[PDB]
Amino acid sequence: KVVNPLFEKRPKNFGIGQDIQPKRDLTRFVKWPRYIRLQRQRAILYKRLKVPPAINQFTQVLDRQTATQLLKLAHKYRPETKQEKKQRLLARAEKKAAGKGDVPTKRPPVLRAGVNTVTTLVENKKAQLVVIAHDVDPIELVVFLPALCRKMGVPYCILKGKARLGRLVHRKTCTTVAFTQVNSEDKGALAKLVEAIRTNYNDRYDEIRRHWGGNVLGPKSVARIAKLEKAKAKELATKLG
Amino acid sequence: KKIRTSPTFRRPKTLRLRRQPKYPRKSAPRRNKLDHYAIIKFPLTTESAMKKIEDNNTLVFIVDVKANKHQIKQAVKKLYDIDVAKVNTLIRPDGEKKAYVRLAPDYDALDVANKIGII
Amino acid sequence: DPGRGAPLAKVVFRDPYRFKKRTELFIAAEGIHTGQFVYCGKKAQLNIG
Amino acid sequence: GAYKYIQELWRKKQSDVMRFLLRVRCWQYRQLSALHRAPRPTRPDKARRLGYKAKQGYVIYRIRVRRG
Amino acid sequence: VRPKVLMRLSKTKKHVSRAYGGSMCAKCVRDRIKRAFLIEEQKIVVKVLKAQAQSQK
RNA sequence: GGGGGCGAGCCCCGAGGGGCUCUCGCUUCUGGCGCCAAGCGCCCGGCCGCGCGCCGGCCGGGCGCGACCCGCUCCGGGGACA
């Protein structure tokens, strides 16, 4: 035989007064530092308090498939890069006087990055689609701007992440991105995205502005309210029906 | 696949580098102003000190106050090429240190006193 | 204990999470002797100390 | 530009949106220490009008003073 | 002797060749031995009676 | 929240059992001891022989159950008042 009867089972009783308790998962009860507890119960306060609709309109975020299609369309129009600026200057510097180059010819259309440029070319109505990051840390930069896009008739969408919105440009953060000019090979996909965004944000801006949101209690109190409601149903539902 | 074992949150041990300076703060290191010549000032020509030399195989010296017994031992061994049994120090009420340098018994004290000049 | 008319009792428990004998300073009731098992908790029986 | 919109947005402090923002920021700044370095201006238009140019070297602190 | 002399003394001058030797007297040692044994045997008896209660009801 | 049963009861019951509320996370005759896991399952590396190698023997390791899962305040007591 390959088995040995010297192998005792010797189980442990993990009860009160019994053998000692194991090093189990204790992430629920860590004394977290002040910044961690502050940034957690700040989001808890955003869940509790009656958030006004001008702030709560940024929880309505454009979904996964349309977000990836919009990123695929914006990747065709991402601006130039550090030292690609230098290549673009050196190519025209060699084009200036080698083969009779006057250079008035052509510049490619690029994106926009700042809220100043975005608001100016929406007030000029030179925009076609305005992308807004939902997670700007001062919200006062973009509160008026969805309403301003609805007023000027420019389609506005809201995406997850100023990080991945600023990865379109070669920087860290970016809050608004405007689509000014698109090519004829991408104009159909641009019109499809404009239709899919306008049937979500612009057409029901009245429901967005009237959509108050908040008063979401914690689960420890929601379970207590549900227990009291089930107790009231148990006390008076079979007395009648 | 990572759980908090302890309920306390201690600060994580992060990597820290060492001093790899781009320029030295001083141009030259400080020269040794505690040399073997400057640490031993003079011997004593007291009759009591000469009786100590003639009887107990020692040499009496007057030393700067910032000196160790090891410093006086290596100082005598460096200056006069003589081995030292022990160094026995006091501080006079004048600011100077007095060192009774007990020599090894293979070398005489009166002969090395004649070498250093005192009699 | 000085400044106190009541005698204190060193009561040693075992810590249920770490292997260590935890001691406590209770006030012994009138009738508590040494070598006595003082229980504590919700399921404890109703007797003195 | 957007700075005038942010300017009258910080002017209209009595509206419900700015009262909510002042309540949340007042809680968040009370739950910190008495003096701490902020990495970016919470109110960039007022910071620019007083002289903050967002470049290397201009630092801002946030500080609590008792009232009365 | 003074407890830093125990650093200087030999090993057999500090304890006695016995379990719990040098820290507990032999009467309390043998009482602790028989106490451990009798509480273990009564736990065996309570476990046998509990197993018989499980087998009956 | 339901998996676990010596269980306490309800409904259905084909008497195997399934759902529902509770008891618990299993210790009270005694001045003993109790930590750094047992057992099981799934894999990995080196050596030797069958050679189709997740096959067999030796030595060394990893993961999960054991120690349930999901959560948004560390638990309680106040609280729109001190």
Side-chain angles (χ1 to χ4, degrees):
Chain A
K1 65 182 177 67
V2 188
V3 298
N4 194 0
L6 273 300
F7 294 159
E8 187 179 2
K9 297 298 293 295
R10 55 176 68 90
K12 291 184 183 293
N13 205 166
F14 295 107
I16 300 168
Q18 295 298 108
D19 199 0
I20 202 168
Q21 299 301 109
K23 300 293 183 181
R24 63 173 62 89
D25 195 2
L26 292 174
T27 58
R28 181 67 174 85
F29 298 101
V30 176
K31 187 177 180 180
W32 294 101
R34 294 180 68 250
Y35 74 102
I36 295 173
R37 72 184 71 180
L38 189 146
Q39 70 182 357
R40 287 178 183 174
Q41 70 186 358
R42 184 179 66 246
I44 295 171
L45 287 173
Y46 285 111
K47 293 180 176 67
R48 296 293 190 274
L49 273 74
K50 188 181 288 185
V51 177
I55 300 170
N56 208 166
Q57 64 182 357
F58 295 99
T59 59
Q60 178 179 357
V61 180
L62 186 63
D63 54 355
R64 184 70 55 82
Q65 184 64 255
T66 312
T68 55
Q69 289 178 356
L70 190 145
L71 290 172
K72 185 64 65 67
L73 190 143
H75 183 75
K76 265 64 185 299
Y77 296 99
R78 291 177 70 248
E80 65 183 1
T81 317
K82 298 294 183 182
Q83 285 73 240
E84 292 292 327
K85 175 71 173 178
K86 290 176 71 175
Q87 270 72 244
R88 195 266 306 279
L89 290 174
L90 194 276
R92 298 185 190 275
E94 294 292 327
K95 189 176 173 66
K96 182 66 181 294
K100 190 177 172 65
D102 295 331
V103 192
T105 170
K106 183 64 70 177
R107 58 180 293 165
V110 296
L111 290 175
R112 299 293 182 184
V115 291
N116 296 315
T117 60
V118 166
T119 53
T120 54
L121 62 90
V122 170
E123 289 174 352
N124 203 4
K125 291 183 181 181
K126 297 294 183 183
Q128 293 177 355
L129 199 150
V130 175
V131 183
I132 299 167
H134 82 288
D135 55 355
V136 61
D137 197 1
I139 201 67
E140 295 88 2
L141 300 168
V142 181
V143 168
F144 62 96
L145 202 150
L148 195 149
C149 290
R150 189 261 185 189
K151 180 67 173 66
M152 289 291 105
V154 177
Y156 67 96
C157 65
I158 297 169
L159 292 183
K160 298 294 184 180
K162 63 182 182 293
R164 65 103 65 81
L165 188 59
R167 288 178 67 89
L168 294 174
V169 298
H170 296 282
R171 272 83 57 88
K172 294 188 290 185
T173 59
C174 182
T175 55
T176 55
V177 170
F179 289 94
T180 63
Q181 295 296 109
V182 295
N183 291 319
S184 66
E185 59 92 20
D186 205 3
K187 189 183 287 185
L190 193 277
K192 180 69 176 177
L193 291 178
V194 163
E195 192 270 331
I197 288 166
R198 186 178 291 171
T199 56
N200 198 3
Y201 292 99
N202 297 112
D203 289 331
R204 60 180 180 89
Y205 179 73
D206 290 330
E207 285 84 3
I208 293 169
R209 188 180 67 189
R210 297 292 179 90
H211 186 273
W212 289 93
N215 209 165
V216 178
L217 279 75
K220 190 183 287 184
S221 180
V222 169
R224 187 175 66 246
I225 294 170
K227 182 175 73 175
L228 266 70
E229 289 293 326
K230 289 186 286 184
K232 288 177 70 68
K234 186 175 89 274
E235 290 296 328
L236 294 173
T238 187
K239 303 292 183 182
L240 273 299
Chain B
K1 195 174 71 68
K2 194 263 188 294
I3 52 96
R4 295 291 188 271
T5 299
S6 178
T8 63
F9 185 79
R10 191 63 63 90
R11 181 181 63 84
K13 186 179 263 77
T14 61
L15 190 274
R16 61 184 180 180
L17 294 175
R18 293 176 64 87
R19 288 288 183 90
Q20 295 297 110
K22 192 175 263 77
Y23 68 100
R25 298 295 184 270
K26 62 178 72 174
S27 65
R30 184 177 293 171
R31 65 178 294 275
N32 194 1
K33 292 183 180 180
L34 198 141
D35 290 331
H36 301 286
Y37 296 99
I39 195 168
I40 295 172
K41 293 181 181 180
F42 57 92
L44 290 177
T45 62
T46 303
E47 182 66 29
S48 178
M50 292 303 294
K51 183 175 173 66
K52 185 69 71 177
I53 291 169
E54 193 271 332
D55 188 74
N56 288 318
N57 207 165
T58 61
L59 293 174
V60 181
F61 292 104
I62 296 299
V63 182
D64 195 1
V65 74
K66 294 181 177 67
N68 301 115
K69 290 182 180 179
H70 299 287
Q71 291 181 356
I72 298 168
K73 183 176 172 67
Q74 276 72 245
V76 173
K77 190 181 264 78
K78 183 64 70 177
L79 291 178
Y80 298 107
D81 291 331
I82 188 164
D83 52 355
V84 172
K86 67 182 181 181
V87 174
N88 204 2
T89 62
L90 65 94
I91 294 173
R92 293 186 294 173
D94 290 327
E96 290 85 4
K97 185 176 287 185
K98 187 185 287 184
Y100 297 96
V101 177
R102 172 69 182 272
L103 296 171
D106 56 357
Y107 290 162
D108 291 331
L110 186 63
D111 292 332
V112 70
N114 290 318
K115 294 291 179 67
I116 66 171
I118 59 171
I119 191 63
Chain C
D1 188 75
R4 185 184 294 273
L8 302 180
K10 298 288 186 181
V11 175
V12 169
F13 297 98
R14 56 95 56 83
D15 186 74
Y17 298 101
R18 293 181 180 91
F19 181 73
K20 188 182 264 79
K21 290 184 182 293
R22 299 289 184 183
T23 183
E24 292 292 328
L25 288 171
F26 290 98
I27 297 170
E30 185 172 0
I32 298 301
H33 63 89
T34 59
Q36 185 176 0
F37 296 107
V38 171
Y39 297 93
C40 55
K42 184 173 74 175
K43 297 292 191 291
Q45 292 180 356
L46 196 278
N47 52 3
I48 296 170
Chain D
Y3 288 110
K4 187 179 287 293
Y5 293 97
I6 298 167
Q7 179 179 1
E8 274 98 12
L9 181 61
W10 283 99
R11 284 182 179 178
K12 298 294 183 182
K13 296 179 180 67
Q14 198 65 40
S15 66
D16 292 332
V17 178
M18 293 301 292
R19 285 179 66 188
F20 179 75
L21 287 173
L22 288 175
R23 184 179 291 171
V24 173
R25 269 74 174 273
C26 178
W27 177 81
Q28 186 178 2
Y29 296 162
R30 185 176 63 245
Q31 292 294 321
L32 290 172
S33 66
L35 188 147
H36 62 278
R37 185 258 179 88
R40 68 180 65 250
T42 306
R43 191 172 175 178
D45 179 67
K46 181 70 175 177
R48 288 178 60 85
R49 289 176 295 175
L50 299 179
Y52 180 78
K53 303 298 291 294
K55 64 179 73 175
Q56 291 181 357
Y58 287 176
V59 190
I60 49 168
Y61 287 179
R62 187 177 294 114
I63 185 166
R64 299 186 294 114
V65 176
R66 289 187 68 89
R67 194 171 186 176
Chain E
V1 74
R2 187 62 40 191
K4 203 178 289 185
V5 184
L6 276 74
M7 185 177 176
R8 306 185 297 175
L9 292 173
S10 179
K11 183 65 178 293
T12 61
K13 295 180 177 67
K14 292 186 285 185
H15 67 88
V16 70
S17 66
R18 189 175 64 245
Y20 291 94
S23 179
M24 189 179 291
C25 65
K27 184 177 184 293
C28 291
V29 166
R30 69 184 71 187
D31 289 331
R32 188 179 296 272
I33 291 165
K34 65 180 72 174
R35 185 177 295 115
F37 174 71
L38 289 172
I39 301 297
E40 182 67 27
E41 289 293 326
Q42 270 70 246
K43 286 181 181 179
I44 294 299
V45 170
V46 171
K47 184 63 66 68
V48 167
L49 292 175
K50 183 68 180 294
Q52 290 180 357
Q54 293 293 321
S55 179
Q56 291 298 110
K57 181 68 176 177

